[PDB]
Amino acid sequence: EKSVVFKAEGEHFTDQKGNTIVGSGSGGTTKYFRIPAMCTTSKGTIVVFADARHNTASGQSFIDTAAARSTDGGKTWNKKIAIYNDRVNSKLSRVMDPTCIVANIQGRETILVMVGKWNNNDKTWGAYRDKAPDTDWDLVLYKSTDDGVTFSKVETNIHDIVTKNGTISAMLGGVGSGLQLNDGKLVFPVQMVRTKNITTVLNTSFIYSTDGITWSLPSGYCEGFGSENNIIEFNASLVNNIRNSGLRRSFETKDFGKTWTEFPPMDKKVDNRNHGVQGSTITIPSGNKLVAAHSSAQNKNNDYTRSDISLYAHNLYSGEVKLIDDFYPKVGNASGAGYSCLSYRKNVDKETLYVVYEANGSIEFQDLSRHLPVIKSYN
């Protein structure tokens, strides 16, 4: 139905030594949660990641990556910290902004989660353009191969490929979920802050891998807009769906990230109004056709309150769009609101469509599976 994954001012976590993490919420709880990411496994297990912003909603604050696991269809949740910040700066050390993938990596069902990491930077990441890359930044990857019970660090070449590019100050996942392609390739949508000498502050792209260890960046870039984005696979194209102030943007690449062109079935189809917001975009099969399901905020107050977090269907053939469910029909908390993440699976003959989203500093979950006939018919 509807459940609270992470309760603002209602959770207590422990650190690596098992000592409680005293946050600024009432009773020493974690103050605020943001930026949910959800991955469902072949066992039906739901894992939801979010920033545990222990002291404040601000992105420049002390943050760990929490993980909530449900094996009862989202009724109840077991919670823990999946990724700890480095504990350099009790005010500013942070791991943030998760993107997850569920994939069979050479046969092995794995949940990957990728987060940015900072320590001493007191400003948002777009402020740091002088270095290639910023010395305070990193982008870390953790995995679980035990159905979300334990997460371990993956040693990658992600920092190295950013350094060898030479034009990137920092990189993050696109927020929410990445994908495993039909052929098996792993793809994280990414956002990047370019070095100062590059005219465009922000770009979108992706990183890809076969084994989850060695990653690659394509040679091209997509225009950044508000840079948070997701990718879907459609025929031999990768198609993104990007945050933008006003109308969301969508581009396709037919050359695996060398060049991008507008994708008419999704480009400019959903309006998030002033500032834009992150949104989640996934595909759902309907026979041998595909439909895109998308969540983002209607933003009725045209501001940072990002009201009315809604599920849409995009007809990938005709370009029609329709509202399926305004599942969080509420004005958000302008300290940080509006974000969401969808998850679809068909396990055996059971199709599930779940969402998680920001709700006044908490993360809530809804089972939206009743909407699948309506979405699937939209081709």
Curated annotation (Swiss-Prot):
One Gene Ontology MF term: exo-alpha-sialidase activity
Membrane spanning stretches: none
Keywords, in A-Z order: Disulfide bond, Glycosidase, Hydrolase, Repeat
EC category: hydrolase
Cystine pairs: C39-C100
Residue windows of the BNR repeats: 68-79, 142-153, 207-217, 251-262
GO annotation, biological process: ganglioside catabolic process; oligosaccharide catabolic process
Entry keyword annotation includes Ribosomal protein: no
GO cellular component, one term: cytoplasm
Residues bound to substrate: R34, R243, R306
Catalytic activity: Hydrolysis of alpha-(2->3)-, alpha-(2->6)-, alpha-(2->8)- glycosidic linkages of terminal sialic acid residues in oligosaccharides, glycoproteins, glycolipids, colominic acid and synthetic substrates
Tagged with keyword NAD: no
Active site positions: G59 (proton acceptor), Y339 (nucleophile), E358
Top-level taxonomic group: Bacteria
EC number: 3.2.1.18
A Pfam short name: BNR_3
Family: Belongs to the glycosyl hydrolase 33 family.
Function summary: Cleaves the terminal sialic acid (N-acetyl neuraminic acid) from carbohydrate chains in glycoproteins providing free sialic acid which can be used as carbon and energy sources. Sialidases have been suggested to be pathogenic factors in microbial infections.
Subunit structure as annotated in this protein's UniProt entry: Monomer.
Alphabetical list of PANTHER family matching this protein: EXO-ALPHA-SIALIDASE, SIALIDASE
Name used for this protein in its record: Sialidase
